Amino acid sequence: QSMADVEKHLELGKKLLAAGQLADALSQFHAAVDGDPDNYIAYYRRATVFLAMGKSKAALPDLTKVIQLKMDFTAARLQRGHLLLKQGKLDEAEDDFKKVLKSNPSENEEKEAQSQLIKSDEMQRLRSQALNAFGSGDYTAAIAFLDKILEVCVWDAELRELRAECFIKEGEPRKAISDLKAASKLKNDNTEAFYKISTLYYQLGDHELSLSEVRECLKLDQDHKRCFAHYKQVKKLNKLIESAEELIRDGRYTDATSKYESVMKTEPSIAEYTVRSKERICHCFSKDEKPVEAIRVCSEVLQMEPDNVNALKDRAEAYLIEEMYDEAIQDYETAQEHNENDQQIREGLEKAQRLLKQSQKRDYYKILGVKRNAKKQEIIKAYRKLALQWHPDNFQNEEEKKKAEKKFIDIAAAKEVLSDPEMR
């Protein structure tokens, strides 16, 4: 009987782990475990790969099987203790940590075991303090407690969740993502955990992520009436925004604008969706050279976010097409306060201020200038007419008159200022 298959599985398995493979190492140790359910080494190796990869649930059962099989082998009960601690299942961990110091206590192990029950004895104390502050209603308090507790028990989902809840109760919902993602990772098959986060990503408009998560919820359970419900939603909503963006890449702005209005229409509750939608619309008009509307919208946007860099920038490019430099600069200058080194913002000013000066100094060819660097005789030709034309004698009413004077003052101003050394 060549039980090589079960043997090779382990060799190949161990080499893979050693190479850093984990994923494949595991595919192998699974083989060995189903190969010889009775063997203890396998259960150990699988368990070590679970651990290596961030998988806490999956490892525990594999460790305790080892214990049961080779009841003697203590490093394993020590391994269990660690896990149960990373898990924050403190009582169970202590009860294991002690039976290590008690049954086959020895060498370096004694130190590890002992130093851990000290963390554990403070942890036990810390969760109480945390759960205290929370129950009584102090969130900021309980946050700081949990922060620490979570350095030692990195894989304690129930607490992470609680911490996440603190953040959101404190109105810092973006901070909760971190914990909620983890919590779902940890439990691996918890239907309500995936909702919890997907729901959150969604509130924050992280709509792409939200969708992948709720896919998960469903991959676990086809029939969840509530995951599905949410899924129809994000799908529809992502489909639209992902579509809109592609149209903004093709410069089909008007089409993108339409798209984004159906976006607001589909998700009208959450502010973040109308806002970001509007931003892009303000962007859509701007890049489409429709400045009036561009201005109209970016105004609404900066009203909700005066610090919205993109919005400022696009509305600036619009002011340009209208030649409103005092405004355009003011905007870039506001965006400056937000981005110190962004080339787009820096280059904004330099282009604008350049044009600002050339605008301030009035042009003479502006009055006619049939040719840039027109011949001195050709100039006089149209001047005679425009001197004939723009003389206040030509029309009766004063209001009009005063206005032509300005043209007259200038038409002649050209003459003296262009002939002789002047002009260049």
Residue numbers in the entry: 32 to 455
Recite the paper's sentences.
P58IPK (58-kDa inhibitor of protein kinase) is a member of the endoplasmic reticulum- (ER-) localised DnaJ family of proteins (ERdj proteins) which interact with BiP, an important regulator of the functions of the endoplasmic reticulum (ER) (recently reviewed by Otero et al.). In this study we present the structure of human P58IPK, including the BiP-binding J domain. The crystal structure reveals P58IPK to be an elongated protein, with the J domain attached to the very end of the TPR domain via a flexible linker. From the structure we can identify the probable binding site for BiP based on the position of the conserved histidine-proline-aspartate (HPD) motif which is necessary for Hsp40-Hsp70 interactions.
Extensive screening for crystallisation conditions was performed using protein both with and without the N-terminal His-tag that was included in the expression construct, but crystals were obtained in only a single condition using protein containing the intact His-tag (crystal form 1). However, selenomethionine-substituted crystals, intended for phasing purposes, diffracted to a maximum of 3.2 Å and provided the dataset which was used to solve the structure in space group P312 using a combination of molecular replacement and single wavelength anomalous diffraction phasing. The two crystal forms are very closely related. Crystal form 1 (P312) has one chain in the asymmetric unit and crystal form 2 (H32) has three chains. If chain A of crystal form 2 is superimposed on the single chain in crystal form 1, chains B and C are shifted only 2–4 Å and 1–2 Å, respectively, from symmetry-generated chains in the other space-group. The crystals have estimated solvent content of approximately 72% in crystal form 1 and 71% in crystal form 2. The structure in the two crystal forms is very similar, with root mean square deviation (RMSD) of 0.8 Å (using chain A from crystal form 2). In both crystal forms, the electron density in the TPR domain is of particularly high quality for the moderate resolution, while the density for the J domain is weaker. PISA suggests the oligomeric state to be monomeric in crystal form 2, but identifies a potential trimer, generated by the crystallographic symmetry, in crystal form 1. However, no previous data support such a trimeric quarternary structure and in light of the gel-filtration data it does not seem likely to be physiologically relevant.
